[PDB]
Design a protein around this ligand. Structure first.
Ligand code: CLA
Ligand code: CLA
Ligand code: CLA
Ligand code: CLA
Ligand code: CLA
Ligand code: CLA
Ligand code: CLA
Ligand code: CLA
Ligand SMILES: CCCCCCCCCCCCCCCC(=O)OC[C@H](COP(=O)(O)OC[C@@H](O)CO)OC(=O)CCCCCCCCCCCCCCC
Ligand SMILES: CC1=C(C/C=C(\C)CCC[C@H](C)CCC[C@H](C)CCCC(C)C)C(=O)c2ccccc2C1=O
Ligand SMILES: CCCCCCCCCCCCO[C@@H]1O[C@H](CO)[C@@H](O)[C@H](O)[C@H]1O
Lengths: 83, 59, 741, 119, 38, 175, 170
């Protein structure tokens, strides 16, 4: 049934680029939805055991980025329903 | 609401005309309900643009 | 198309057929040769899809019966407004609400029971309200007794319009089925007309009644200097003093300068620190949001004007690959079978009532509601209980669809029966989730029970011991702390004070404290997920095995309320789709009994109580949850042994009627077991051995005295197990919190 | 399973492609010309016989009982006519001479491998 | 005409008799309360 | 139409003693079968004629020994003077003797359709009590008209309270 | 192409009076014209009697309780609380028993001209001819003309200073 396992990265183009340049400042990230995340993962990626529940932009921009990224890749497989 | 120069009714009639431009497409019959439905939709869109334009930035 | 065809002079209105009991059922108009006709008369009083298969006549019967239900509800609310008028201390309660306990019902003075008239203050006594009517009347702005009398008499007026409406819509103007299967118009008027104009007009009442009145009562004005809601609309001048945006009129509305309406409407959230309720600016603004949002919502259903959807072209369009046919058939299921509609609407109605409970304890929306803790408790508890029962009504009427109104021709390869192709894989994984959650929700309690009993408290699941800090709930609660600055940009406070900032106290009574969730609250949430999954197991086993199981492959040929098949297959007692609902009512009692035993004991340990000098803290049990909810001896001892003590010592006082409805409800609970355990193969010739003693004295009753049937002889065990079981916690709870709060 | 339990394969024919309901559940395709149907146990099969026969005509139908040795059986009918209808081939077994009222008391049957009704 | 037949049924006359003897007990226990003699 | 009005030509009625016509603009006789309503019309108009003659006769100065009037409504001077007197009880109770006892079965006679729902007999008059066709119907319409005028007239005799606070004769003594 | 509008055809000609059939928007095609014609006539009434209500708003002999609220909105500001709520009530009383069976009778489908046949001490109206329909057509033309005159007399005070109507020409 999944006849088209074609592309996934078109969602990574499709979800980061639509969420980088709109900053919409006075929220947690003064930058965009993704720029507040890629800067806030490189501080923790080099085997840092920290990141508690008070680490806001790691957990919050973890879930809010995965929930639109999941939705846009699922809708990308819906992008092989019109065939 | 001000006159002919750029104001809140200036950015409403563009929403009304793109609304009826949708009404030429969404079962685009030329009846009453194209205007009463579709000018209502562009009216909704215009209200979403006026005050959403009012909060974040210049009106 | 949409047109209303109405039969006129359908049924004559004589009292002739009242003299024929069981006129309605040709299976039951034979008359009672046995006493089982007596109970089958009442078990077939509302089997409307068993009177006649003609859905027109059925649909007239039900649609006229709804007006009878609304007639009883308007008699009920007219009763509450009159008991508020003549009998309540509401006028005196409006002066000082934190001192005067709310009472309406004033017990008649017969032997002893005049002692139930509790001297609750206000100069006049009577038994104390826990239903919280006075908080909804202070919110609604009812000032003196006159609006309670007049609104009561309007309640009887609408009750007369619903009796006359139901008589009018069964007898002398009753519609056709083509009116009823016109369902895009029905949604089109209930989303928009009912709920839309309901929330909009209620925003009218709050802005033109409650905002001036509950601004004045928030300022502490006595209920004599308060003007009538009458007098705020003759002139805008009495409201421009209170809210200076009324001076501009509707002119900033029509120019869309809605910044000007920050006086009337806002987005603040939190609670009022003075009244302990929600800001009625936020609540009136809220009902405007439901107003415009639902009036948007109503207009998506094409009726006559070719603008809008139909449900058919929606459900056909989701022709998904893993379902094959898509949702084809559901518009023909839900517009020809009433019981399926009752399954959906009872599921969503019941879960809405649960949502109502959870949104009322933490965001107490009425003024001085979180101050008097019994009205805060019992409006969680009551809406939790009807919010339970309606889900079992979903699990029943889904099965009543599946037994009666299932037809495989309309229902062939769609989303529905493709479940039933793998209902073994549905119910088997519910079976696994039920065992896994039972081990990991109650085995933790036997664990902490043993480790506390074995002395090794180092091996428990406390905060000191092996902790089970709920990670996800604490994280998202921490997000809700960080809402009103970051994401709720135009807010001021959080969504509740169950989430964020320090507590709100009104009259040295803790209205809402931020609830802490550590390693005991965790395990009780797994109780709730567990006993929710068991009711989902019995109420999906009751539906997927409703029509044709693999044990009994003809259940639709047997029916819905059949008892059994026989001793064959080694015994097939209690196997019908009704009998799973019989089981899901006991699990309803379990699941909600530990929901409210989580509620009324975490919030007697972590929220409620008083505050003392220098803002110091005092709970009712005094923080005695996380060291005590982890076990069962802590649960049974420290909750059911300790909180009972104000129900049990309640004699000689006004709380003694709960001391009677406590023991009598233990009696009814214990009295159900006689019906549940035994069966009519005993009682039928026990009874016939008594029929010998009537035949000897010629006192043979002409209606032959059978015992109950099997399904009645277990339905009554449910209806006593729940009446006694629910009224135990009722009397225990109200006698607990009235005795302190 | 099929390697050790008696599978019940129900063979029947029809005239038009109707749609019936499986005893496993849901709607079935119901091949119009001729169709066999494997099942699990006999009550499913004769419950399907009631499912189709009480609705409409599905005659020339009977399950071939696939016992796991490999071959078939034939029960409903055997003489070709419907069981509650009366044919002059069937030999009655399973009777006694009178009601239960003359059946023997089980103290007369105690310590014997008899029945409470054979006499 | 046939309403009096409905007012002769079992539950209605059950309420019009147990309501009545109930009123005998309550009206006989307002006038002479606390009656343990006789 | 058969109505002397906008349009609803003889919805059910017309032969009843409405001599200027059949009024009925709202759908009550459409679904109430009209006999109940005719008894309600006639009984309300009788008791309203007694009401308005009661208000006039009480305003023309009769008390054995009671409270002075200053109004004949607004309970704790007039109506709740006599209830706490234990006085209007029996004059209600005999109405209970009229209504529950000899008016409720008569209303039952005004359901089965053998009543002509005025008619409690009751003509204690010689030379003018024609039971027949002409004077009985033209006098029943006269009872009906003076009774209806008693209904609205008693409405006006009640609601002169706000800018009156006084009697009706003293309302005539001021404009 | 019914002799008023642009080149677009109009279906409706079914016994309404005022035979021009000016339907640009085709609201006939979604509403019954007995209803809409009763809105034609019924708004026309208030246009008439409210037009001369403004022409007698500043005129000779009054009911004589006034002299200060001689304006229009000031009349609607002063009188609603005391003197005009029964101008509402004595037409709600006529309305719920007169207009409700009239409009609901015509949308129900009865046969009646929506003029709700009434008091007539004048008018020829006994000879069934084109004078009766002529007074229908002149009546509705005077109604819509008085109605356009009501936005005239509304916008002869708002963007003119709230002064009198007859004295605006000074
Ligand atoms: C393209 C113009 C435009 C702009 C700049 C905005 C801007 C805004 N809209 Mg918006 N809106 C628009 C068009 C626009 N809207 C249209 C066409 C509609 C459909 C009618 C809406 C419907 C809409 C809703 C329903 C809501 C917003 C809201 C908002 C605000 C917060 C959005 C957020 O969380 O991020 C923001 C000021 C939200 C808000 O908080 O309003 C202040 C909100 O609830 N908008
Ligand atoms: C916008 C119009 C409108 C409104 C307000 C309602 C409201 C309601 N409908 Mg309803 N309905 C409508 C249109 C409407 N309907 C249409 C068009 C259809 C046909 C497609 C139906 C078919 C329908 C069914 C089949 C059922 C309902 C039911 C209900 C009730 C749900 C109970 C409730 O919320 O109690 C809250 C109660 C109130 C808010 C009081 C409402 C009373 C006000 C005055 C509105 C009633 C106006 C009335 C409908 C106008 C009739 C015209 C006539 C007088 C000439 C509620 C009263 C259910 C019910 O209980 O039956 C009565 C039910 O089973 N409706
Ligand atoms: C307190 C009494 C009691 C208990 C313990 C249970 C327990 C259970 N019921 Mg239940 N039930 C009860 C009363 C009870 N019921 C009553 C009164 C009714 C009346 C209506 C029902 C009706 C009912 C229905 C209708 C269904 C169940 C089901 C289940 C099972 C749910 C799965 C689960 O939790 O596994 C976890 C097991 C436990 C929590 C039990 C304790 C196990 C401990 C934690 C571990 C083992 C102990 C120990 C180590 C054993 C080894 C030592 C020993 C060998 C010597 C579970 C075993 C469902 C079912 O079949 O299973 C899905 C089901 O469909 N029940
Ligand atoms: C079911 C709930 C439950 C749980 C979670 C525990 C847990 C525990 N108990 Mg225990 N206990 C329970 C019920 C439970 N108990 C009950 C009901 C009783 C009374 C009958 C007791 C009586 C008891 C005693 C008397 C003692 C404990 C002790 C302990 C601790 C050590 C036991 C041990 O070595 O685990 C053994 C664990 C395993 C063998 C692991 C099997 C399970 C694995 C994790 C499943 C994984 C499958 C995997 C997810 C598959 C997916 C992946 C795959 C597809 C690749 C441990 C915390 C001891 C202690 O001192 O506490 C510290 C101790 O002395 N318990
Ligand atoms: C996923 C979680 C979540 C939720 C529930 C909300 C919810 C809300 N946001 Mg929001 N927001 C979120 C994430 C979320 N936001 C994120 C990730 C951003 C950054 C892009 C924003 C940026 C944002 C702005 C800029 C505004 C809202 C506003 C609002 C409120 C109006 C409804 C709306 O958005 O339209 C509502 C309470 C509006 C508000 O505060 O009005 C009350 C508003 O102006 N939000
Ligand atoms: C049907 C049962 C019943 C019976 C036999 C009586 C009998 C009586 N009532 Mg009674 N009563 C009843 C029901 C009944 N009542 C009910 C249901 C009410 C509530 C409305 C009352 C309210 C009532 C009052 C208020 C009074 C009586 C009084 C009386 C006595 C007058 C003779 C008599 C003993 C009178 C009496 O003697 O009491 C002092 C009196 O004043 N009754
Ligand atoms: C305007 C006053 C008025 C008039 C004209 C009538 C006229 C009538 N009444 Mg009457 N009635 C009145 C006031 C009036 N009533 C009042 C106030 C009461 C309440 C006590 C009654 C109670 C009453 C009863 C109980 C009955 C009548 C009846 C009658 C009819 C025959 C009696 C007769 O000859 O009338 C003479 C008229 C005058 C002297 C004047 C007659 C049409 C009888 C009838 O058939 O009812 C319709 C009858 O049984 N009336
Ligand atoms: C320009 C003023 C004007 C004109 C030409 C008409 C003309 C008409 N009206 Mg009319 N009407 C008017 C003002 C007017 N009305 C006003 C102000 C009111 C409110 C009081 C009414 C209330 C009214 C009612 C209630 C009815 C009419 C009716 C009629 C029609 C027949 C009666 C007749 O001969 O009228 C003569 C008109 C004049 C002499 C002009 C007035 C000077 C006729 C078309 C009747 C109708 O439509 O059915 C036939 C009807 O029932 N009118
Ligand atoms: C929810 C995530 C589920 C992912 C299923 C994604 C999903 O449903 O895709 C939808 C898919 C149906 O695929 P189609 O493309 O046919 O769907 C379109 C059609 O359904 C519409 O006609 O359904 C399944 O595959 C059923 C699998 C159920 C298997 C069990 C899932 C339930 C287990 C999870 C229970 C969790 C509830 C708590 C949530 C936290
Ligand atoms: C006790 C019992 C009975 C016997 C219950 C009897 C038959 C009913 C007793 C109550 C009825 C209502 C008594 C009838 C009396 C009438 C009400 C008339 C009395 C006069 C006034 C009270 C109106 C069963 O039939 C039964 C069936 C299946 C499982 C368990 C049981 C079971 O435990
Ligand atoms: C350039 C000229 C603009 C004139 C602006 C006038 C603004 C208000 C328009 C309506 C006039 C009446 O004003 C109403 O007054 C009533 C009460 O008198 C209230 O509803 C409001 O103030 C206005 O709606």
């Amino acid at each position: 049934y999944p006849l088209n396992p074609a592309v996934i990265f078109i969602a990574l183009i499709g979800w980061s680029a639509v969420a980088a340049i709109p900053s919409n400042i006075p929220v947690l990230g003064g930058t965009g939805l993704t720029q507040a995340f890629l800067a806030s993962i490189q501080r923790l990626l080099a085997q840092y055991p920290t990141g508690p529940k008070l680490d806001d932009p790691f957990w919050f921009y973890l879930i809010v980025y995965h929930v639109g990224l999941f939705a846009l890749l699922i809708f990308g497989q819906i992008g092989y329903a019109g065939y | 609401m001000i006159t002919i120069p750029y104001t809140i009714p200036t950015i409403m009639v563009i929403s009304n005309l793109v609304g009826v431009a949708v009404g030429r497409y969404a079962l685009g019959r030329s009846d009453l309900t194209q205007l009463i439905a579709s000018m209502c939709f562009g009216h909704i869109i215009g209200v979403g643009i006026v005050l959403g334009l009012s909060n974040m930035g210049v009106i | 198309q949409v047109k209303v065809v109405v039969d006129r002079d359908v049924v004559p209105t004589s009292f002739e057929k009242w003299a024929k009991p069981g006129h309605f059922s040709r299976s039951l108009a034979k008359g009672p040769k046995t006493t089982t006709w007596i109970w089958n008369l009442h078990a077939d009083a509302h089997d409307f899809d068993s009177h006649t298969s003609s859905l027109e006549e059925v649909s007239r019967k039900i649609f006229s019966a709804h007006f009878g239900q609304l007639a009883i509800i308007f008699i009920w609310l007219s009763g509450m407004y009159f008991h508020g008028a003549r009998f309540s201390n509401y006028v005196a309660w409006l002066s000082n609400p934190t001192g005067i306990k709310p009472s309406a019902q004033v017990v008649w003075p017969i032997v002893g029971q005049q002692i139930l008239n509790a001297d609750v203050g206000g100069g006049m006594q009577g038994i104390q309200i826990t239903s919280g009517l006075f908080q909804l009347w202070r919110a609604s702005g009812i000032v003196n007794e006159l609006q309670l009398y007049v609104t009561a008499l309007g309640g009887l007026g609408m009750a007369g319009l619903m009796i006359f409406a139901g008589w009018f819509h069964y007898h002398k103007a009753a519609p056709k089925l083509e009116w009823f299967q016109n369902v895009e118009s029905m949604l089109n008027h209930h989303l928009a007309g009912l709920l839309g104009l309901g929330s909009l007009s209620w925003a009218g009442h709050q802005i033109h009644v409650s905002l001036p009145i509950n601004k004045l009562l928030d300022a502490g004005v006595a209920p004599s200097s308060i003007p009538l809601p009458h007098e705020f609309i003759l002139n805008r001048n009495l409201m421009a003093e209170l809210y200076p945006s009324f001076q501009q009129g509707l002119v900033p509305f029509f120019t869309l300068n809605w910044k000007q309406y920050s006086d009337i409407l806002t987005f603040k959230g939190g609670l009022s620190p003075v009244t302990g309720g929600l800001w009625l600016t936020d609540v009136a603004h809220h009902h405007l949001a439901i107003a415009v949002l639902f009036l948007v919502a109503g207009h998506m259903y094409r009726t006559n004007w070719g603008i809008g959807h139909s449900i058919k072209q929606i459900l056909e369009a989701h022709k998904g690959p893993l379902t094959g046919e898509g949702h084809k058939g559901l518009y023909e299921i839900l517009t020809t079978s009433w019981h399926a509609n009752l399954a959906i609407n009872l599921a969503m109605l019941g879960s809405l009532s649960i949502i109502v409970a959870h949104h009322m304890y933490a965001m107490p929306p009425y003024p001085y509601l979180a101050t008097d803790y019994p009205t805060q408790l019992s409006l969680f508890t009551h809406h939790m209980w009807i919010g339970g029962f309606c889900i079992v009504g979903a699990g029943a009427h889904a099965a009543i669809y599946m037994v009666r109104d299932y037809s495989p021709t309309v229902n062939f390869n769609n989303v529905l029966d493709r479940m039933i192709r793998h209902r073994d894989a549905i119910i088997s994984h519910l079976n696994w989730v039920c065992i896994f959650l039972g081990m990991h929700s109650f085995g933790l309690y036997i664990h902490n029970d043993t480790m506390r009993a074995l002395g090794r408290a180092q091996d428990m699941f406390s905060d000191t011991a092996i902790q089970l800090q709920p990670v996800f709930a604490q994280w998202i609660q921490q997000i809700h702390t960080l809402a009103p600055g970051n994401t709720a940009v135009n807010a001021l406070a959080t969504a509740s004070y169950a989430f964020g900032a320090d507590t709100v106290t009104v009259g040295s009574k803790i209205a809402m404290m931020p609830i802490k969730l550590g390693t005991a609250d965790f395990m009780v949430h797994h109780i709730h997920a567990f006993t929710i999954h068991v009711t989902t197991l019995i109420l999906l086993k009751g539906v997927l095995y409703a029509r044709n199981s693999r044990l009994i492959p003809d259940k639709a040929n047997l029916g819905f309320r059949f008892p059994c098949d026989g001793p064959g297959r080694g015994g097939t007692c209690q196997v019908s789709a009704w009998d799973h609902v019989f089981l899901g009512l006991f699990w309803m009692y379990n699941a909600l009994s530990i929901v409210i035993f989580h509620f009324s004991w975490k919030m007697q340990s972590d929220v409620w109580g008083t505050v003392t000098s220098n803002g110091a803290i005092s709970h009712i049990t005094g923080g005695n949850f996380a060291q005590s909810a982890i076990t069962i001896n802590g649960w049974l001892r420290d909750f059911l042994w300790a909180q009972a003590s104000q129900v049990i010592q309640s004699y000689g006082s006004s709380l003694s009627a709960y001391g009677l409805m406590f023991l009598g409800a233990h009696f009814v609970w214990a009295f159900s077991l006689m019906f549940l355990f035994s069966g009519r193969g005993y009682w039928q010739e026990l009874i016939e051995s008594i029929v010998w003693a009537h035949n000897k004295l010629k006192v043979a009753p002409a209606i032959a005295p059978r015992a109950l049937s099997i399904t009645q002889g277990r339905a009554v065990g449910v209806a006593h197990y729940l009446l006694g079981g629910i009224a135990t916690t009722w009397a225990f709870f109200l006698a607990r919190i009235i005795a302190v709060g | 399973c099929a390697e050790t339990e008696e599978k019940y394969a129900m063979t029947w024919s029809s005239d038009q492609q109707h749609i019936f309901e499986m005893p496993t559940g849901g709607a079935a395709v119901m091949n119009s010309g001729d169709n066999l149907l494997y099942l699990a146990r006999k009550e499913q099969a004769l419950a399907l016989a009631t499912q189709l026969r009480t609705q409409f005509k599905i005659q020339d139908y009977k399950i071939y009982r696939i016992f796991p040795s490999g071959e078939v059986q034939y029960l409903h009918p055997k003489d070709g006519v419907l069981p509650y209808q009366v044919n002059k081939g069937r030999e009655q077994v399973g009777r006694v001479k009178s009601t239960i009222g003359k059946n023997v008391n089980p103290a007369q049957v105690k310590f014997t491998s008899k029945a409470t009704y054979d006499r | 005409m046939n309403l009096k037949k409905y007012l002769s049924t079992a539950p209605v006359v059950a309420t019009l008799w147990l309501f009545l003897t109930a009123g005998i007990l309550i009206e006989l226990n307002r006038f002479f309360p606390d009656s343990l003699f006789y | 139409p058969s109505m002397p009005f906008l349009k609803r030509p003889s919805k059910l009625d017309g032969s009843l003693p409405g001599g200027e016509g059949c009024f009925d603009p709202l759908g009550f006789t459409e679904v109430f079968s009209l006999e109940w309503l005719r008894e309600a019309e006639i009984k309300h108009c009788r008791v309203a004629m007694l009401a308005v003659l009661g208000v006039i006769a009480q305003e023309f100065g009769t008390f054995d020994f009671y409270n002075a009037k200053s109004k004949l409504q607004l309970s704790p001077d007039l109506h709740n003077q006599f209830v706490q007197n234990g006085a209007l009880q029996q004059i209600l109770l005999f109405v209970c003797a009229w209504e529950f006892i000899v008016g409720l079965p008569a209303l039952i006679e005004s359901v089965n359709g053998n009543r002509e729902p005025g008619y409690f007999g009751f003509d204690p008059l010689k030379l003018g009590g024609t039971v027949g066709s002409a004077q009985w119907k033209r006098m029943q319409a006269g009872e009906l008209r003076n009774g209806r005028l008693a209904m609205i007239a008693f409405g006006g005799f009640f609601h002169q309270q706000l800018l009156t606070k006084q009697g009706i004769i003293e309302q005539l003594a001021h404009f | 192409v019914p002799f008023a509008p642009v080149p677009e055809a109009v279906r409706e000609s079914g016994l309404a009076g005022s035979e021009a059939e000016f339907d640009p928007l085709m609201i006939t095609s979604y509403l019954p014209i007995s209803w809409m014609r009763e809105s034609e006539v019924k708004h026309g009434r208030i246009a008439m009697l409210a037009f001369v209500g403004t022409l007698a708003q500043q005129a000779y002999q009054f009911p004589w309780y006034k002299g200060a609220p001689t304006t229009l909105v000031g009349a609607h500001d002063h009188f609603v609380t005391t003197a005009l709520a029964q101008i509402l009530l004595f037409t709600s009383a006529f309305e719920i028993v007169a207009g409700v069976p009239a409009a609901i009778q015509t949308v129900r489908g009865s046969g009646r001209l929506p003029g709700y046949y009434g008091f007539d001490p004048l008018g020829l109206w006994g000879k069934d001819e084109a004078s009766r329909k002529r007074m229908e057509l002149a009546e509705v033309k005077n109604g819509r003309l008085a109605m356009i005159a009501m936005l005239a007399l509304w916008h002869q005070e708002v963007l003119s200073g709230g002064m009198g109507v007859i004295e605006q020409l000074v």
